Paper text:
A HEPN (higher eukaryote and prokaryote nucleotide binding) nuclease Las1 and a polynucleotide kinase Grc3 assemble into a tetramerase responsible for rRNA maturation. Las1 and Grc3 are highly conserved proteins and have recently been identified as core enzymes involved in processing and removing ITS2 spacer, which is a key step in the synthesis of 60S ribosomal subunit. Recent studies have demonstrated that Las1 is an endoribonuclease that contains a HEPN (higher eukaryote and prokaryote nucleotide binding) domain responsible for rRNA processing. Grc3 is a polynucleotide kinase responsible not only for Las1 nuclease activation, but also for nonspecific phosphorylation of the 5′-OH of the 26S pre-rRNA produced by Las1 cleavage, providing a signal for further processing by Rat1-Rai1 exonuclease.
To better understand the differences in the mechanisms of Grc3 activation of Las1 between different species, we also solved the cryo-EM and crystal structures of full-length CjLas1-Grc3 complex at 3.39 Å and 3.39 Å resolution, respectively. Since the crystal structures have similar quality and resolve more structural information than the cryo-EM structures, the subsequent presentations and descriptions are based more on the crystal structures. Structural superposition shows that the conformations of all Grc3 domains and Las1 HEPN domains are almost identical in the two complexes, while the conformations of Las1 CC domains are significantly different. We compared the HEPN domain dimer structures in CjLas1 and CjLas1-Grc3 complex by superposition and observed that significant conformational changes occur in HEPN domains upon Grc3 binding. Notably, compared with CjGrc3-bound CjLas1, ScGrc3-bound ScLas1 has a more compact catalytic pocket, which may explain why ScLas1 shows better ITS2 cleavage activity than CjLas1 in the presence of Grc3. In addition, His130 in the ScLas1-Grc3 complex active site and the analogous His130 in the CjLas1-Grc3 complex active site adopt two different conformations, which are similar to the conformations of His142 of CtGrc3-bound CtLas1 in two different active states. This observation may also provide a structural rationale for the activation of ScLas1 and CtLas1 by Grc3, as well as for the fairly weak activation of CjLas1 by CjGrc3.
Numbering used by the authors:
A (entry chain D): 5 to 77, 79 to 103, 112 to 162, 176 to 197, 211 to 278, 303 to 334, 338 to 367, 398 to 421
B (entry chain C): 4 to 107, 116 to 164, 177 to 198, 209 to 283, 299 to 349, 352 to 374, 405 to 420
C (entry chain B): 60 to 132, 134 to 143, 151 to 187, 203 to 351, 353 to 391, 394 to 411, 417 to 500, 502 to 589, ...
D (entry chain A): 60 to 147, 153 to 187, 198 to 399, 401 to 500, 503 to 588, 590 to 594, 596 to 598
Write the structure that this text describes.
Amino acid sequence: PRLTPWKSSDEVVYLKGLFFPADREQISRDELYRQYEEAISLVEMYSSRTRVSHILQSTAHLFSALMMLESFEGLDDTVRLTASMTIIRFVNGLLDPNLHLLAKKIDLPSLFVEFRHSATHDALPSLEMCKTCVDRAIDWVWDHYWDGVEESLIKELKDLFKQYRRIRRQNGKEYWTCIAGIKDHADMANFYNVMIERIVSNKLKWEHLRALFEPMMNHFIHLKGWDFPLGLIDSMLSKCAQKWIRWLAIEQIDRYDDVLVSKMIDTLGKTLNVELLEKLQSRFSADPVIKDKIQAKLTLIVTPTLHIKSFESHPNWTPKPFGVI
Amino acid sequence: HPRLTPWKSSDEVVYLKGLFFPADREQISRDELYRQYEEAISLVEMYSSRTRVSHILQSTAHLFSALMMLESFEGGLDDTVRLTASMTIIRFVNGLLDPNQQSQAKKIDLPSLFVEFRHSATHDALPSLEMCKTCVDRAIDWVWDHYWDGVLSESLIKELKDLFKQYRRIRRQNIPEGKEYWTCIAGIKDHADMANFYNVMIERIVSNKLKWEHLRALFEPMMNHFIHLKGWDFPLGLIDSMLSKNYEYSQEFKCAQKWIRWLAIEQIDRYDDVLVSKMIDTLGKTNHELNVELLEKLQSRADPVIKDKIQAKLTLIQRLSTDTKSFESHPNWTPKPFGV
Amino acid sequence: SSNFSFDDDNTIYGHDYVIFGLKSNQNLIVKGQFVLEIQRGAIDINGVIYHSGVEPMKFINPSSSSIPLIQATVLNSSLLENKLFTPGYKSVIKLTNLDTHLESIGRVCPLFKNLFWQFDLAFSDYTFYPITKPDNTVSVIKHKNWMDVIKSLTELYSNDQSIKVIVIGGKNSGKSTFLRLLVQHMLSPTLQQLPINFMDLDPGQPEYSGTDCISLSKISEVQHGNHLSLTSTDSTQCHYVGFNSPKDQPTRYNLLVEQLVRSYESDGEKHESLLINTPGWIKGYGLELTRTLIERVKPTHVIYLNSGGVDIDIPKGTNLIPLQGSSRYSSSQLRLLKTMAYFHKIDDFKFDFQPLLFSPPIQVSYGVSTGISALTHLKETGIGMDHLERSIEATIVGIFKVKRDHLEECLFNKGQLPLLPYKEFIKLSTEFFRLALVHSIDQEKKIMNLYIPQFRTLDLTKEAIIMVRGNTDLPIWEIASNEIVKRFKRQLPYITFEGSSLEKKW
Amino acid sequence: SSNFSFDDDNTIYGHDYVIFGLKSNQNLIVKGQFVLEIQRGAIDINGVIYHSGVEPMKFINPSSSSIPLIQATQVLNSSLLENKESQETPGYKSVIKLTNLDTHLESIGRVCPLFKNLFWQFDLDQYELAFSDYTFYPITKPDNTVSVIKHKNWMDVIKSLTELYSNDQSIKVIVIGGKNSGKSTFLRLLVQHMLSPTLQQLPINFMDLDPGQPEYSGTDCISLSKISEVQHGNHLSLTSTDSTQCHYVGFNSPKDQPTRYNLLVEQLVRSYESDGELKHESLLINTPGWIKGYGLELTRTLIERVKPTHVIYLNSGTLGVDIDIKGTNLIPLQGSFNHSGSRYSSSQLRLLKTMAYFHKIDDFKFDFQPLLFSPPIQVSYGVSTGISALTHLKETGIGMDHLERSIEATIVGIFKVKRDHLEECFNKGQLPLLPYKEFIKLSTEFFRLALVHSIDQEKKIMNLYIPQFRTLDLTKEAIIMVRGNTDLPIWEIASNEIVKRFKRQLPYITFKGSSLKKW
């Protein structure tokens, strides 16, 4: 179980996008260098939290160093140093898990062998040569490291929810617990909304679908981190579904909190159809500064209030794996 | 024995001691000490351009461009700054160590830090900014103690005395044997290569102490023979020296000019314009009355082009004294070191 | 082939503690963590003999560290009142089981478990086990000189007044072993009892310091076990180097050191007489760090464990000793444990090692609002402001104390997290409060979620919250412990399953 | 200690020239410069048979280079040789003679007591009667003076190549070796073979891309020259050797202008693919010293860029993997062998080569009296049409004010530019200082390198010293100039006879230093 600086695995293939455009041409010759500087401050950033693969880290310098070798147009001594040192370090790093033989297996180009030697023991190699190197090496990493680079759970969640539908249907206890357990199974995934498609599935009638649906919606709300209650609507934006939203609108007013209000501002944008906002706008009623603010949003076709924290232990808290707040 | 110095006159390196290090290390502005550093480095690169420069100096001109590199920093990404300084630290040590055949010791006395610095930079984690910055000055100072502080700021008489004296007997001689006399005269003449020699002539005339003009007369076959032998070149540097000598001076005062007339009378015939000017300007250089007089003398001595210049300068020296071309060889050539 | 004196029948199997009567020609060797009164006699351990009168002492000898032998080797005027059926052999040692819940490390890491006293002749199972049959694990010994050199000072100690004292050693030098060897001798209440004053300046191999700290620590009692600084000896200030080693902030590190000997200077002269450790580094700059240190200290004495010395030569009087030194399994990895251990201590000698998720963690809000005001980055200060907030997360950050007026200072960017530029940060007086690990940070409320090992709730009026992210790493187990990958189905917020060419930390 | 048939060959001293009569076995090492005709018989030199008919040849073989043996081994083989006899013919083998070169190359010595006896002018009691002194003579009595013969493969492989030539086919050949490999002695060894009289005198195309240790190139030049006549000794770029062009690389080594270097070569390749194609002359090549790192890389790029015709390598290598087998040859390293004192440092022998260029009156006449005596070919400063600007080859960044100083006392290249081509876009002002960036872009043909003497700050004109030229008259093309990396030989600025003239403080020199740091 190795440790990864990039919290998602994912931001890696995103760090191949910036370093390499792929749609390399045709693009602005400074957009190369605006993307590179997010990726260079990330590898620095990615490097800062924890060690990063040497191969990866050197890319970060190599690209920046190349940035040195273009923006340039005077006294070149410093810029034969940045790129030389990076190349020299870069080669020095690649080699050292332990000489003519060693390069051949390693496959570092022979010239790549020379430059470290020449810069180290000789006149600074010319900037024009370095460009050959910095680029040449850069191709190298792409050549090697860069170029190369549930069902059961779902069913159980579904079962749990379905169990809930039966429990309500009969119309504290351990069975009460069964509902609580379900809530965690939906927090963990990003598919909590996926149920929402499911809840619609149970519904056969107005309110009565709500009546069984309704107790949960309030309860999910009552414990904190009830943004998902805002969150579900985000799923809702895809928008029978509409009926839920209005009740969501009716329910939201009931959830009369600034964050709850906040969802609506977030909520209003999700709802392109005039009616959803209007009911939204209508409910807001345009009296608060936020109420004033919302109209601006509506017009468009924003932070309401301070959010405060303290050294107080979270009151209700479940195991979260250094992720998902 | 000789070697090629990039800097002409081996003077500036002394200067560079001033440029790289200012005499005062605190009072002068950093913005201006940083201007100061810039001038020094540029010459060195130029010096590198002219010829290879001792690696101490090559690294001195890298070390000060890495001191401004580190100290001038405005914050942000120190990825770039470490590399520039780091190589500079690294390149430098290597040069000193490198002319090291065996047993690689610090007999050279390079400090402990510097070996440390390379390894961290060379293979280990890059050195931190404070680390480079602390080190270079440590590095910067070392050269100053090691190298920089340290770099700080006859046959002829006999020939003239024996090339002129021998003639004097010859002067006595005048109303094979003929061969020696020509040779002695020639010998002084070939002999008087020297820049020094013109000064010698003035001394010689004074030395006579008791000579009538005729004693000069013995000289004249000799003096012209010199004018004879080498030509017109001789009386130039002979008058371009008497005049400077005369100006310096302003019978010994008296005797020469009288010679000067003797010189004065006979060569205006053979004289070009450009040289008369070389006299007219040298004559004008003197504020002394003497030369004002020599000017009128040259003036009264046919040719209208010359007569305007002697006068044009003359009334100026009478009014400063009352003040109270491409792909052609050299017209007149006199070999010089690739100086001048 | 170290073996300990073995007693049977005379040996007593007693409940929750072990008591033995020891023949004079006997030695006792103990693994584990035990509290020890003595019943009758004098026991000299590692050249220190402790009388019957003295109060029981707590030992946390670890498997990796060399054991401190408990010699019967034996008459002390009383004073010490020794004290049960049989007089037996000359000395009567009393052993009591210690519940410190150390040895619970086994739960977190499989390899780590064996270090302490748990099981994994007829022997009852408690925290402490004596290895009668000679076995591979080491027994404490030192050259007499090594004992003597620390020993020699002590007589000076009895007389007035203060001796300032330095050591220098390689990281693997075993001086750290050297520096706790001393503290026992001067302390022992056969001697002047004034609290020896103590300074630790090596972050890399700190003692009396959870990782990446330098410490002045007034040592009053006798740490008889290879405490990792897990037990508390009162100290005025930890101080956060933020780096494993001096190099990361030479200016910060040197500027800090001088600000610690001051308090030391205040009590350097105040009967208690100063003690110090130096970075293991002797090669290169850290010698200039040792030599710069020597002059400021005006230390009375100094010690070096190896020869290679001349710079150290002037002007202080110096002592050259044997390499000594001492499974870890790797000494370098031990750092994580000293680092990890900080969190799992409810109180000294009591550590819960259930993974740190399952507790209710602490929120504070990253706003000009008091609880947390700002964060600042040591080392690289050019992390883009929109990447700082994600950098802090999944890291082992440390919270700080600054005064409010100073606190106002010049945060740079208020929205989200108000970054504090480093340059401003060094300048202000800072007082450290506690280590922290933050499970996650919420963008949405700006509230941030952090674990801290233990605290009094940090009440203050307008002392701005202080943060810093140094170089100290995170032990893997807390995120990925087999315990927290079976109760959390495998997925990696930050972690991955075990190969491409080529990518592995240089 | 090699030896050559002594004689005892009924020699007549003559006066100017010495005439040799050879029994079949005897063959001669000759030490020095000389020209030879052949009066009877068929002498063969280095595995090539030359008869009476053939026009004479000029030898500059030098102590540093190996000595080309002059075999008499070939029996008269064809009616092709004609013999002219006014002497003795007698029925004994072949009669041949050469007469003194009179190069005047000999006076290396005055500048350099190191260089004395590179060419033999009597450099101590005589041990032998019949001794005479001339520009040329044998080592009749063995000494460690280097003969030249190469493995029959080495001779054969090139000789193996030659046979193909008689038939219509044209071979574009390569060669690659490390300096001291013997490529320089080898590539000399081939063009002799091809140009040999039996073959039709197509002028063999020879390309030299080697700036450090060139052959048929001034120091830091690249040139492809049709060679119509054989250089029979190792003339160090000392022969008329008519060729299309020289290009000023500006460095000892390829990398000095890597972007500039590669670009320069290709264009060079187009006049070689303009005429290489003709096949009247098979293209030939010299390849730089580098065999690992870029030079191998330039080489592969070089190898692909032009068809090999044939590819040769002197030692087994990691190179062999890198470049495809494209069929290619492998011969042994065969590095030329001499004592360094005997065979002067490659960086040390360049100074002779750098030096020789200024001092050559004509291809076969050399004056070694220091340059200072001669007039300086004084030229304009500023936007004047004579010379227009200086663009620095590599150390482009410098103070504008300083740059004028830099030029003096250096070897700089005289370029040709036409019309406003020069005008493509500093201070006029002390100097134009046209930049490198602007320069790489402009087309440019290169004039012979120029010494700089006594550049005049006061008025634009700067004395210059330069080698032989027809008047450099161009209607609009200014002499754009370039200070690269090429050094200054010590002797010309300071030699023994120049110290004598003044003994004055060096304008740029100093006169024992020990200890304190060259890299």
